[PDB]
C-alpha cells in the first residue's frame, strides 16, 4: 500500500519458508493473493506484479507433496487462470518486467543476477505445465470417462503452448526459443491424416479464401517449418540424445502427412541404428515407435516387401508390450523385477499415442501372406529348398495345426481363414477377412486410406492367387485362353500380359507365350517328376554333404 518496500520485504519473508516442515502449503498461495487483490495502484505497474505472479503461480505449483501424483482438476484450472492472466500482463505492455531499466519504475533486480532467466522463468513454467498435463494423461483410466473435460484442459494447454511461441523477444528471435518450438512440435507430431488434409481434402476451392484460412494452411506447414528453422537453433547442439529423439518424431510427420518417400529417405540418411546405442532408454522406445508407423505406411502405400521387413523386427519379439510400458512381471515368466518396471510406468505413456497391436499383427501377417503363399505353392510344386523357418511360415503354422477351426472368431483365425482361401486360389476368400474381420476387428476402420488399401490388397490377391493356381495347374494345361484369366480373376489384358510375361521370364517356366494372339502353349510334364526330382534331390544331397565329410576328414 506504500511504495513497493514493506511489500517487497514481505515478498522476501513469504518466499523464505519455502520447503521446511511447517508450510501450511496452500495459504502461501492465499497470502500471495493477499498482496494483489489488495494491490490496486498505478503505473507502477501494471508493471511489476508480473513477477510476483510468477512466484505465485509457483505457489500454484509447489503445494504438492512431491513429483508423482496429478493435480486436482480445480487446481489444474486455477493454474491455467494464473498462467493466462500472466499472458495478459506480458503482451500489452512491452517493457520487460524483471529488468531493462527505464525511468525507474520500480525495482531493483539488476542487482540479482540477470533480469532475464527470471525473464526466462515463463518458458520454465509452461514446460513444467506441459509435463503436469502429461502426468495427468496417465492417471485417468482408460476406455472411459472422467475423461473429456480433461481432454479439454488438453485443448487449453494446446492454447497455452501456441501462445508461448509468437512472443519471443528472447533476446529477440531465433537463437534459443527453439524449445517452445520443441513443445509445440511434441503437440503437433502425433496428429492425423485429417489435419494434414484439411488443407487438401477439405476442398481447397470449397474452403474460405479469408488470411485466416492461409494461417490454417500454414498451420499445417508450421511444424515441418520448425524442422527447417530450429535445426540451427539446435543446429548447433550436437547432443545425440536430442538429435536421435527429434529426427524420429520428424520421420513420423512425413509418412503420414505426405510422402512415405521422404520418410524412407530421412531414416536411411540419418543411420540412427548406431546412434540409439549412444541414446538413453526413452529414445529406444521412439526408435521402436517410428518403425511401427513406417511398416504401417508401407502397407498403406501397398508394398508387401517393405512392410514385411519393417514389421518383422517387432514381430520377432513380444516386447512391444513392455516397450509401451504395459508389461507385467509375470506374463510368461521373464519380466522381473518389480521396482524397475515401475520406471517404465512413471515414464510411459499417454493413452492417446497408442495403436492396436492386433492391427500391427494382422498388417504384418497379411503383408507376408502375398509373398509366401505363391512361394510355398511354388515350393510344393517342387521348387523347395527355399523353405525358411521363424517367419510368417511359423506364425501361419501354429494357427494351421488346429484340428477344430470352423468359423474364425479371432483376428489370427481370420488371417488363417483368408490364407486357406488364397491356397485354394479363390479372390473370394481374401474378401472375407478383408471385409468382416476388418469390421471386427476395426483394422479397416482406422484409416481413410483403407479405401486405397482395399484396391491394393484386392488386385494383388487376384494376381498372386492366379499365380498359386498356375503353380499347380500348369502340368494339367496344354494351352490357355489368356482372355479367360483376365475375365475370371477380374483383371485386364494389359496387366495380365505384363504379369504372365514377368512370370514366364523370372519364375523360369517352360511356357511359350503368344502375347498378340493371347495364348500360352506349355505342355510341361510330368506328374511322376514330383517323385523323380525328389529322389534326384535325395540323391544329389548325398554327394554335397559328403564333400564336407571329406573336407572335415582331411
Amino acid at each position: 500500500e506504500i511504495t513497493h518496500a514493506v511489500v517487497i520485504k514481505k515478498l522476501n519473508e513469504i518466499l523464505q519458508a519455502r520447503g521446511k516442515k511447517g508450510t501450511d502449503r496452500a495459504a502461501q498461495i492465499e497470502l500471495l493473493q493477499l498482496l494483489v487483490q489488495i494491490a490496486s495502484e498505478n503505473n507502477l505497474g501494471e508493471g511489476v506484479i508480473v513477477k510476483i505472479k510468477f512466484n505465485i503461480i509457483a505457489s500454484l505449483y509447489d503445494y504438492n507433496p512431491n513429483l508423482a501424483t496429478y493435480m486436482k482438476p480445480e487446481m489444474w484450472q486455477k493454474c491455467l487462470d494464473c498462467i493466462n492472466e500472466l499472458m495478459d500482463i506480458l503482451f500489452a505492455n512491452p517493457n520487460i518486467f524483471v529488468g531493462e531499466n527505464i525511468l525507474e519504475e520500480s525495482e531493483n533486480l539488476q542487482n540479482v543476477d540477470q533480469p532475464l532467466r527470471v525473464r526466462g522463468c515463463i518458458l520454465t513454467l509452461v514446460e513444467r505445465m506441459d509435463e503436469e498435463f502429461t502426468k495427468i494423461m496417465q492417471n485417468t483410466d482408460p476406455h472411459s470417462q472422467e475423461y473429456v473435460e480433461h481432454l479439454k484442459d488438453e485443448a487449453q494447454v494446446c492454447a497455452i503452448i501456441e501462445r508461448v511461441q509468437r512472443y519471443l523477444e528472447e533476446k529477440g528471435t531465433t537463437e534459443e526459443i527453439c524449445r517452445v518450438y520443441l513443445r509445440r512440435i511434441l503437440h503437433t507430431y502425433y496428429k492425423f491424416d485429417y489435419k494434414a488434409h484439411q488443407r487438401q481434402l477439405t476442398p481447397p476451392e470449397g474452403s474460405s479464401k479469408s488470411e485466416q484460412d492461409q494461417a490454417e494452411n500454414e498451420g499445417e506447414d508450421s511444424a515441418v517449418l520448425m524442422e527447417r528453422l530450429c535445426k540451427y537453433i539446435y543446429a548447433k547442439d550436437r547432443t545425440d540424445r536430442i538429435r536421435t529423439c527429434a529426427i524420429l518424431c520428424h520421420i513420423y510427420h512425413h509418412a503420414l502427412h505426405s510422402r512415405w518417400y521422404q520418410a524412407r529417405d530421412l531414416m536411411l540418411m540419418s543411420h540412427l541404428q548406431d546412434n540409439i546405442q549412444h541414446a538413453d532408454p526413452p529414445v529406444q522406445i521412439l526408435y521402436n515407435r517410428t518403425m511401427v508407423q513406417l511398416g504401417i505406411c508401407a502397407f498403406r502405400q501397398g508394398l508387401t516387401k517393405d512392410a514385411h521387413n519393417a514389421l518383422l523386427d517387432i514381430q520377432s519379439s513380444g516386447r512391444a508390450k513392455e516397450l509401451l510400458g504395459q508389461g507385467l512381471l509375470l506374463r510368461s515368466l521373464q519380466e522381473r523385477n518389480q521396482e524397475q518396471e515401475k520406471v517404465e510406468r512413471r515414464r510411459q505413456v499417454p493413452f492417446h499415442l497408442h495403436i492396436n497391436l492386433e492391427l500391427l499383427e494382422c498388417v504384418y501377417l497379411v503383408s507376408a501372406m502375398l509373398l509366401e503363399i505363391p512361394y510355398m505353392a511354388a515350393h510344393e510344386s517342387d521348387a523347395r529348398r527355399r523353405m525358411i523357418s521363424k517367419q510368417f511360415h511359423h506364425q501361419l503354422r501354429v494357427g494351421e495345426r488346429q484340428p477344430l477351426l470352423g468359423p474364425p472368431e479371432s483376428m489370427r483365425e481370420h488371417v488363417v481363414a483368408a490364407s486357406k482361401a488364397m491356397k485354394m486360389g479363390d479372390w473370394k476368400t481374401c474378401h472375407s477377412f478383408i471385409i468382416n474381420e476388418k469390421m471386427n476387428g476395426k483394422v479397416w476402420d482406422l484409416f481413410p486410406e483403407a479405401d486405397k488399401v482395399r484396391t491394393m490388397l484386392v488386385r494383388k490377391i487376384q494376381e498372386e492367387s492366379l499365380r498359386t493356381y498356375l503353380f499347380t495347374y500348369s502340368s494339367v494345361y496344354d494351352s490357355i485362353s489368356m482372355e479367360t484369366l483376365s475375365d475370371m480373376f477380374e483383371l485386364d489384358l494389359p496387366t495380365v500380359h505384363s504379369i504372365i510375361s514377368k512370370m514366364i521370364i523370372n519364375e523360369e517356366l517352360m511356357a511359350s507365350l503368344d502375347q498378340p494372339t493371347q495364348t500360352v502353349v506349355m505342355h510341361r510334364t510330368e506328374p511322376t517328376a514330383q517323385q523323380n526330382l525328389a529322389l534326384q534331390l535325395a540323391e544329389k544331397l548325398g554327394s554335397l554333404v559328403e564333400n564336407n565329410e571329406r573336407v572335415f576328414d582331411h
Binding site: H143, L151, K152
Partner: protein, 253 residues
Amino acid sequence: LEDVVRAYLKLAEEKTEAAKEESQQMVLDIEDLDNIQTPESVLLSAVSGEDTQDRTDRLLLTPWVKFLWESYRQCLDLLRNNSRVERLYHDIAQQAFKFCLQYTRKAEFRKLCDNLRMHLSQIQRHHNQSTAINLNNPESQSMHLETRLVQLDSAISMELWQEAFKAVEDIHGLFSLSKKPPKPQLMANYYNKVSTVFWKSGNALFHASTLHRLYHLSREMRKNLTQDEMQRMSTRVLLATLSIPITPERTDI
C-alpha cells in the same frame, strides 16, 4: 441357507439391472446426447477407440457385472464346490451361464476352469463325508444334463468353441467313469443337440455320422420313447441324407 443365498444373489442381480438401465437410459442418452459431429478430441482418439456408450457404461455398469461375477465365483464355488446334497448348484450354474452370455464372455473361461477343477477334485478325490457315489444317478444325471445344455448352448452362443470342446471332453470322461449304469433319457436329447451344433464347423461327414447316430437313438428311444409321427421319420431321413451327400473328398493342403 437356501432362502438366504437365493435372496443374496437376487438382491445383487437387481442392483446390476438398475445399474445398467440407469447408465443405459439416463447416462447413455447424456453421452451421445445432442449432436454427434466434431468432438474436438473425439476424432483424434478415433484411431484406437470405441463408442461413447461402452466408454461411459464401463463407468456405471461394469461395477454391477464385476461384483456379480466375483460373487458367483466365490459363492457356491468358494462355499459349496461339493458337499453332500442340496442342488441349488444347478440354478447357480444356469445364472452364471446367463451372465456370461449377456455381459463379458471371458468369465466362461474362469467359470469353466473352476468347474473342471471341482469335478477333478471329487472324481479324483474321494476323501470325505461327501456324496457316496455308487448308484445315485439322480444328482449325477442332473448335474450332467445341466452342465451339458449349459456348455453346449454357451459355446454355440458367444461364438466359442474351445469351451464346447472342454465340455464334450468332460461329458466323455463322465460317461467313462459313469458307464456302470444302463442309460437313462436325455441321452437322445444331448446327442441330437451336439450333432446339430456340429453340422457346419466340422464337415457334414462326421456331422452326418452323428445325425445317423441320433437317428439310431430315435429307434431305441422309440421302442422305449414311442413316437407315433411320420413327419418325424421324414425329417430324420432328410437330415441323414444331406449330412451324407455333401463332400466326396477333403482338401488336405
